C-alpha cells in the first residue's frame, strides 16, 4: 500500500509536500495523503476543521490546483497561510459551500480570469500558530466558485497591501479544505506553476 490515513492534529512532510492537517473535533475527520501535492479529506458531522498541503514557508509562488470538493454545508477551497510579526492568516477562497466568507469590504483585485472581493476580519482569543491569540485575518473570496486554476499569489498580496492589509513574516501556505460542521469530502492537488 502507501498512501497514509492521519486523524490527529499533526504537521509534517509527505511525499515532499508540507501538510498541516488540524481540528477541534476528533474522530470526525480524517485527511488521507496522496502522491505529490495531493490530499483527501472526509468529513461527518464535524466542528472545526483546517486541512492541506503546500509549503511550511509561504510566498509570492504563482500555483496551479485541482479539486473535488463535495461539501454538505459549510465548508472553503482555500490557499491559506499564515505570518508572524505580525501574526496574521489569510485565505484565498476559490470555491464555498453553504456560506460565502465576507468581512469589511475593501476593494477588489482582478487575477487569473476572476475577480475578488477583499475583506479584513478579527479573530479573538483563537487558535493559531501562535496559541491562542487576537489578530487579522485577510480575505480574497473568488465573485464566482472555481475549483481548479491557477492563483498568483503575488497580485493578491499586493492588493491586499493597497488596502493597508500588511503581511509579516511568512509560515506555512497550503491549499485548504475548511469546514464547520455538517459532512463533506474532497481531493485536492496542488503545485507551483502557472
Known amino acids: 500500500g502507501s498512501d497514509t490515513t492521519i486523524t490527529q492534529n499533526q504537521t509534517g512532510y509527505d511525499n515532499g509536500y508540507f501538510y498541516s492537517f488540524w481540528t477541534d473535533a476528533p474522530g470526525t475527520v480524517s485527511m488521507t495523503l496522496h502522491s505529490g501535492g495531493s490530499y483527501s479529506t472526509s468529513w ?27 461539501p454538505s454545508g459549510n465548508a472553503r477551497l482555500t490557499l491559506y497561510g499564515w505570518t508572524r510579526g505580525p501574526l496574521v492568516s489569510y485565505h484565498i477562497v476559490e470555491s464555498w459551500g453553504t456560506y460565502r466568507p465576507t468581512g469589511t469590504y475593501k476593494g477588489t483585485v482582478t487575477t487569473d480570469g476572476g475577480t475578488y472581493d477583499i475583506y479584513e476580519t478579527w479573530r479573538y482569543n483563537a487558535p493559531s500558530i ?29 492588493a491586499w497591501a493597497r488596502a493597508g492589509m500588511n503581511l509579516g513574516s511568512h509560515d506555512y501556505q497550503i491549499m485548504a479544505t475548511e469546514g464547520y460542521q455538517s459532512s463533506g469530502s474532497s481531493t485536492v492537488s496542488i503545485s507551483e506553476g502557472g
Open 44 to 70: 461527518r458531522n464535524t466542528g472545526l476543521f483546517v486541512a492541506g498541503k503546500g509549503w511550511s514557508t509561504g510566498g509570492r509562488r504563482t500555483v496551479t490546483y485541482n479539486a473535488s470538493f463535495n
Open 130 to 158: 501562535e496559541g491562542t491569540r487576537t489578530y487579522q485575518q485577510f480575505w480574497s473570496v473568488r465573485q464566482q466558485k472555481r475549483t481548479s486554476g491557477t492563483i498568483t499569489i503575488g497580485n493578491h498580496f499586493d
